[PDB]
């Protein structure tokens, strides 16, 4: 009986594949969080920018 031995072979490989994919899944997620965080701080950062432009235009006009 060697076809049941094939099938065993497959089941095991498939376990490895599914575990690796689990990890990959985790990796992608950490990326998403690092990213969504960076993107958020950069909204507050564009606020400081527009504030700075205004502050700076002010200085241009009392000179």
């Amino acid at each position: 009986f060697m076809k049941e031995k094939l099938l065993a072979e497959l089941e095991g490989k498939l376990r490895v594949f599914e575990n690796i994919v689990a990890v990959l899944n985790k990796e992608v997620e950490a990326s998403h969080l690092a990213l969504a965080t960076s993107i958020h701080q950069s909204q507050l950062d564009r606020e400081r920018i527009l504030s700075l432009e205004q502050r700076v235009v002010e200085l241009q006009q009392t000179l």
Binding site: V16, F17, N19, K26
Partner: protein
């Protein structure tokens, strides 16, 4: 067949969150997950390491704490 690195990685499905180092560089550094906490093990020399601080280098820590490792010598 898949690389020994990948097969090592596949041991990390049950790795905790909050750990400052990726299961990727941990596997690339020659360690598989021991199943206990954040503890990994070199298949080859058998060095075990845990409590990983922010910005650790898994590779450097393997070369330093066991320069004799056959694996850590090819890496």
């Amino acid at each position: 067949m898949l690389s020994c690195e990948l097969y090592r990685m596949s041991t990390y499905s049950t790795f905790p969150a909050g750990v400052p180092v990726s299961e990727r560089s941990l596997a690339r550094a020659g360690f598989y997950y021991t199943g206990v906490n954040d503890k990994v093990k070199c298949f080859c020399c058998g060095l075990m390491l845990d409590n990983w601080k922010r910005g650790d280098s898994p590779t450097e820590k393997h070369k330093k704490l066991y320069p004799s490792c056959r694996f850590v010598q090819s890496l």
